[PDB]
RNA sequence: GGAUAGUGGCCUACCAUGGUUUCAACGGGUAACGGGGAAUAAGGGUUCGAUUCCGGAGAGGGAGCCUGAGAAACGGCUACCA
RNA sequence: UUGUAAUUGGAAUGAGUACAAUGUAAAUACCUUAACGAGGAACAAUUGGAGGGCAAGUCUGGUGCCAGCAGCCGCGGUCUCCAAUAGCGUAUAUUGUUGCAGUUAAAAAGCUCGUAGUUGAACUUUGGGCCCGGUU
RNA sequence: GUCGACGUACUUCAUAGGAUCA
């Protein structure tokens, strides 16, 4: 049974990038998925994406430009303190400034650098690099 | 003149270290930063150096090794020119150390390590376990 | 009987002070470098 | 799934599963059950006392042979008979029948060497710094 | 012709099953700090 | 009973004492400076390792950090005072170059 | 209600049948006094802590007391066990 | 221009001894200091390891004169190097949360149901227009 | 009783492959 829709979306995006497809279909959609994709969009790893409404959970179509090396979800969503962020960046990213660790903090879903600037913390959703 | 028996009395901080092609793979595999990992291992500023042979060697690798190619082109990593036709990096790396005794060799190939070992006064850096290790460097 | 040193090997006087021993070793090493 | 629970509230299952499995190690099992000294040559001690029964290689023609340096000793703790080495035949003169000898870990099959005889170090005797009390 | 060997299913007791083959459950009777037991046991043996 | 008095070891054995290059380096050092034994060289190496580890840890801290500023300034002042570090090289990077 | 400096099944009389437990009770083992701390480790961890400070308990083993603000005291007392 | 000195010159000093003073409750010691205190500076540094060579000598074996073991012992007669260094040697002891593996060489239960336990689709204020004061 | 099963502790057998040269 479906446990994490975000995991399914990120896996579909990774597979589509691997195969060289220029665009991918993600089903079902969600607010968390849309915010994650918006973070990736802000950092340029993905292009334009369009949400299709069918009176159900919904669907998404994402344009891919081939700039994405990897995107993943960290399940379970561990509670991350401000001190503990650097540990996660060391563990998940191939280098220090290569990629981003995305957190759902009390101020929204954001990359770890924005979290450090805003001095917030929360749970960890995944990473993109 | 730079060598006292087997002790090199010229290599002093900050160190100039040649990056081998395979060194980047295991640096990525072990999630070890190039610039800081060398800083931790030696407790000194390190100037990584990438030659044309290794750089051409990386580009031939393919799309799979794009990350290594991106790291190799980081602005902090200086580039070393080559005045030789052959593109084999191992032969190039052995050549440079023979000419001038100031370079650390960062690599993980068993074969290249043995050839450098026969040359006296060449510190030989490698990545193993969780971080970098330096073998023939008394100042450590 | 007093010291009771027993049977011990013959040891060069240079062993009594390490500083002198290392001084001699280093100067000998320099003379060897001049040949290398 | 890697075959392990990953839920955030699954600490108990991870703890209990780990505790049951640590007993698979032989190092852990020996360490907890206090059976790590069964394999030890002296049964947990670093040195053992023994009684010199006979000098087996006393008669061997070739001097300073490996056989010449062996002495058959009876372990006092359990009475089992074992073989022990002597540093050299010169030391073998000091050792004679029916003395207490302190053995330590070391011709294959000989795993013990004599370090003291009659409460005095062999090396002290060999260096002419002490006399064997009788 | 050399047929391939059939690796037999284990009938020798597993490490977790050996602990119950004796009269009692060997796991229950264990010390709290085995590190102290090893250090104390060795010193006592030398004195004995 | 009276309160304990602190003590500490001023030297440590190197990771691999038997490296031939290391042996030659110690020989050269002892001969040049007339050192009595390898203990003195190990002592100076231990002090230098401590200093450089402190400098590296401070460097890991973000610039303008009050701890970095205060401790780095104190360390550089000490090194300059003893004469190891020159006046013009008053930065933590040159502390790692000692 | 009694007793205690005092709350309280702490004990007594009469009443109900309750209380804990697979989120591990109860029973067993402990070379189990607890902590501040020590070592190792890159990090997670693993082990050690009778032992300079804090707190607890004991004065050969059980039991019971006088005095006193304070003791179930033991360099105080009484009995029993050795 | 290298190595070796029971060769040789006169300068230095504390280990120790000791007037004294200081120290201390009184003492010892430390820090001071008259006078003594150095060539084998016998004012006699140690603990381990490696490698030799010597005989009218001893033992063992055999495709002659050799090889192995080894050699404090013979006819008379009463040695070198290496490591640490006021320290050195010997013996015993010293599982994956991050992150393990399960076709063919550890380990997937014969199968299904099922309680506890762990886990469990999406959705409910989003966006827009201004003002204020901060850093770089 | 040179007894059976189990537990424990050990011992042992399975290492060469390619290239060149004679
Ligand atoms: Mg999967
Ligand atoms: Mg009642
Ligand atoms: Mg304890
Ligand atoms: Mg107890
Ligand atoms: Mg305690
Ligand atoms: Mg009491
Ligand atoms: Mg008593
Ligand atoms: Mg009492
Ligand atoms: Mg008493
Ligand atoms: Mg008392
Ligand atoms: Mg259920
Ligand atoms: Mg949900
Ligand atoms: Zn080149």
Q: For E36 and G39, how far is CA from C1' in angstroms?
A: 14
Residues A62 and A83 grouped into a single domain: no
Nucleotides of H under 7 A from a protein CB: 2-5, 41, 45-48, 59-60, 68-73, 79-86, 90-102, 104-108, 117-124
Same-domain check for residues A51 and A93: no
User: Quick count: other Cβ atoms within 10 Å of Cβ B27?
Assistant: 24
Same domain, A53 and A75: no
Which nucleotide's C1' sits nearest to the alpha carbon of D41?
H92
Is A81 found in the same domain as A53?
A: no
Through-space separation of residue A120 CA and nucleotide G34 C1' in angstroms: 39
Is the Cβ atom of E5 within 7 Å of strand I at any atom? no
Give the list of residues 6+ apart from residue A35 with CB closer than 8 angstroms, or none.
Answer: A108, A109
Domain span at D120? 1-134
Are A27 and A4 in a shared domain? yes
Residue where the block lists tokens 């070391």? D106
E41 closest-nt by C1' vs CA? G31
For A55, phi and psi rounded to 5 degrees?
Answer: 60, 20
Residues A81 and A128 in one domain: yes
Best probe of the F interface among C26, C30, C32, by most F CBs < 10 A, is: C26
> Looking at the 3D structure of chain A, how many domains does it have?
2
Spatial neighbors of A78 by CB under 8 A, at least 6 apart, are: A123, A124, D8
Distance of alpha carbon A39 from alpha carbon A111, whole angstroms: 7
Residues of F in contact with B136 (CB under 8 A): 19, 21
Instruction: State which of A15, A44, A68 marks the end of a domain.
Output: A68
Question: Closest approach of chain A CAs to the CA of B31, in angstroms?
Answer: 5
- For residues A79 and A55, membership in a common domain is answered with no
Which tokens is A102 given?
A: 């995305």
Contact state of F93 with B45 under an 8 Å Cβ cutoff? yes
Final residue in a domain of this structure, among A68, A90, A113: A68
Contact B8 F22 (CB under 8 A): no
Instruction: Provide the domain count of chain D.
Output: 1
B101: β partners: none
A23/A57 same-domain check: yes
Given a contact cutoff of 8 angstroms between Cβ atoms, the answer to whether D115 and D47 are in contact is yes
Read off the tokens for A59: 């669907």
User: Which chain D residues have a beta carbon less than 8 Å from that of A77?
Assistant: 8
Q: What is the DSSP string of chain D?
A: --SS---TT-HHHHHHHHHHHHTT-HHHHHHHHT-TTSSSTTTT-SEEEEEEEE-GGGG-SSTT-TGGGEEEEEETTT--EEEEE-S-HHHHTT--TT-EEEEEE--TT--EEEEEETTEEHHHHHTTS-----
Record the tokens describing residue F20, joined without a space.
């031939």
Nucleic strand H near CB of residue C32 (< 7 Å):
no
A89 and A121 share one domain = yes
What's the Å distance between residue B51 CA and nucleotide H76 C1'? 83
| Technique used | cryo-EM
C-alpha span between F5 and F11 (Å, rounded): 19
Mutate to test the interface with D, among E24, E34, E39 (most CBs of D within 10 A): E34
Last residue of a domain, one of A34, A68, A102: A68
The neighbouring-strand residues paired with D75 are D50
- Preceding peptide of A86 cis, ω within 30°: no
Look up the CATH number of the domain holding residue A100.
3.30.1490.10
> What does the angle CA B62 – CA B64 – CA B70 come to, to the nearest 5 degrees?
85
CA of D43, C1' of I11: distance in angstroms: 19
Alpha-carbon distance of D89 to D66, in angstroms, equals 10
H75 C1' to D64 CA distance, Å: 27
Taking CB atoms and an 8 Å cutoff, what residues of chain B touch A91?
31
Whether B88 has its CB under 8 Å from any CB of chain F: the answer is no
Q: A94 and A35, same structural domain?
A: no
| A-contacting residues in B 109-128 (Cβ below 8 Å) | none
Helical H runs in chain B?
Answer: 21-29, 34-42, 52-59, 66-72, 89-99, 110-118
What's the gap in Å between the CA of A50 and the closest CA on chain D?
31
Three-state DSSP state, B81 = coil
Q: What is the resolution of this structure in A?
A: 3.2
CB atoms within 10 A of CB A83: 8
Residue of D nearest to C2 (CA): D129
Q: How many interface pairs between D and E have CB atoms less than 8 angstroms apart? A: 40
Spatial distance between the Cα atoms of A70 and A78, rounded to a whole number of angstroms: 20
**Domain ranges, residue A61:** 1-68
E12: nt with nearest C1' to CA: I6
- CA-wise closest residue to D8 among A69, A4, F33, E16: A4
The answer to whether the Cβ–Cβ distance between D7 and A77 falls below 8 Å is no
Domain shared by A34 and A76, yes or no: no
Query: A63 C-alpha to center of ligand 8: Å?
Result: 87
Token pair, residue D103, equals 């053995």
Dihedral sign computed on CA atoms, order B16, B20, B22, B24: positive
Helix (H) or strand (E) holding F23: helix F20-33
**Integer Cα distance of A35 and D69 in angstroms:** 83
- The residues with which D4 forms a beta bridge, in sequence order, are none
Ligand 7 midpoint to CA D103 (Å): 36
Flag whether residue D81 sits within 8 Å of chain E, measured between CB atoms: no
C23 touches strand H (CB under 7 A): no
* Dist CA F14 CA F51 (whole Å): 16
* CA–CA distance, C31 with D48 (Å, rounded to integer): 54
Domain co-membership, A61 together with A75: no
Measure the CA–CA gap between B89 and B83, rounded to whole angstroms. 13
CATH code, domain with A21: 3.30.1370.30
DSSP B64: G
Size of interface A-B (CB pairs under 8 A): 17
Strands A79-80 and A108-111: unpaired
Residue A3 alpha carbon to ligand 12 centre in Å: 8
**Torsion sign (Cα): F20, F25, F29, F32:** positive
Residues 6+ apart with CB under 8 A from A30: A5, A6, A57, A58
- D45, D46, D47, D48: best to mutate for the E interface, most E CBs within 10 A: D45
Backbone angles phi, psi at B19, to 5 degrees: -90, 125
Please report which helix (H) or strand (E) contains residue F41, including its range.
helix F38-60
Contact by Cβ (8 Å): F44, F29: no
Q: In this structure, is the dihedral angle defined by the CA atoms of residues F30, F36, F42 and F45, taken in order, positive or negative?
A: negative
CB of C4 less than 8 A from some CB of D: yes
Strands B78-80 and B7-8 turn out to be unpaired
Q: How far apart are CA D121 and CA D132, in angstroms?
A: 9
Nearest Cα residue to A115 out of A80, A71, A75: A80
CA–CA distance, F24 with B6 (Å, rounded to integer):
7
């Amino acid at each position: 049974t479906r446990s994490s829709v975000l995991a399914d979306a990120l896996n579909a995006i990774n597979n589509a990038e691997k195969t060289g497809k220029r665009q991918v279909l993600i089903r079902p959609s969600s607010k968390v998925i849309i915010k994650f994709l918006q973070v990736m969009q802000k950092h340029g790893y993905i292009g334009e994406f369009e949400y299709i409404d069918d009176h159900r959970s919904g669907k998404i179509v994402v344009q891919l430009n081939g700039r994405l090396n990897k995107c993943g979800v960290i399940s379970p969503r561990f509670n991350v303190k401000i001190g503990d962020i650097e540990k996660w960046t060391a563990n998940l990213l191939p280098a220090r400034q290569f990629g981003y660790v995305i957190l759902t903090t009390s101020a929204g879903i954001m990359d770890h650098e924005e979290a450090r600037r805003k001095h917030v913390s929360g749970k960890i959703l995944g990473f993109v690099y | 003149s730079a060598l006292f028996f087997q002790y090199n009395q010229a290599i002093k901080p900050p160190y100039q270290v040649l990056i081998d092609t395979n060194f980047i793979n295991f640096s990525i595999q072990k999630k070890v930063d190039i610039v800081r990992g060398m800083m931790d291992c030696l407790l000194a500023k390190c100037n990584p150096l990438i030659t044309d042979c290794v750089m051409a060697e990386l580009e031939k690798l393919g799309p799979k090794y794009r990350i290594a190619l991106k790291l190799a082109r980081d602005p902090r990593i200086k580039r070393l020119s080559c005045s030789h036709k052959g593109t084999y990096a191992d032969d190039c790396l052995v050549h440079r150390v023979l000419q001038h005794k100031c370079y650390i060799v960062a690599t993980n190939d068993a074969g290249l390590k043995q050839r450098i070992r026969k040359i006296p006064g060449i510190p030989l850096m490698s990545v193993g376990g969780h971080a970098y290790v330096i073998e023939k460097l008394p100042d450590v | 009987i007093l010291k009771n040193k027993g049977l011990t090997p013959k040891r060069n006087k240079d062993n009594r002070n390490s500083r002198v021993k290392k001084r001699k070793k280093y100067q000998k090493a320099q003379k060897k470098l001049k040949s290398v | 799934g890697k075959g392990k629970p990953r839920g955030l509230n699954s600490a108990r299952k991870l703890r209990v599963h780990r505790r049951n499995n640590r007993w698979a190690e032989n190092n852990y099992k020996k360490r907890l059950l206090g059976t790590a000294f069964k394999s030890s040559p002296f049964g947990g001690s670093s040195h053992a006392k023994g009684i010199v029964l006979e000098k087996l290689g006393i008669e061997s023609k070739q001097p300073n042979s490996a056989i010449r340096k062996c002495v058959r000793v009876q372990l006092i703790k359990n009475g089992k008979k074992v073989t022990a080495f002597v540093p050299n035949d010169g030391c073998l003169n000091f050792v004679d029948e029916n003395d207490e000898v302190l053995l330590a870990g070391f011709i294959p099959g000989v795993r013990f060497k004599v370090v003291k005889v009659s409460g005095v170090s062999l090396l002290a005797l060999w260096k002419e710094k002490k006399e064997k009390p009788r | 012709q050399s047929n391939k060997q059939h690796r037999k299913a284990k009938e020798k007791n597993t490490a977790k099953k050996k602990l119950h083959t004796q009269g009692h459950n060997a796991k229950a009777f264990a010390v709290a700090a085995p590190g102290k037991m090893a250090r104390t046991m060795q010193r006592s043996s030398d004195v004995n | 009973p009276r309160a304990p008095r602190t003590y500490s070891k001023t030297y440590s054995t190197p990771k691999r004492p038997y490296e031939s290059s290391r042996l030659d380096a110690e020989l050269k050092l002892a001969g040049e400076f007339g050192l009595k034994n390898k203990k003195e060289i190990y002592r100076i190496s231990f002090q230098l390792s401590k200093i450089r580890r402190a400098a590296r840890d401070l460097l890991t801290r973000d610039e303008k950090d009050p701890k970095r500023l205060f401790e780095g300034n104190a360390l550089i002042r000490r090194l300059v005072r003893v004469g190891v570090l020159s006046e013009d090289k008053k930065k933590l990077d040159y502390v790692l170059a000692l």
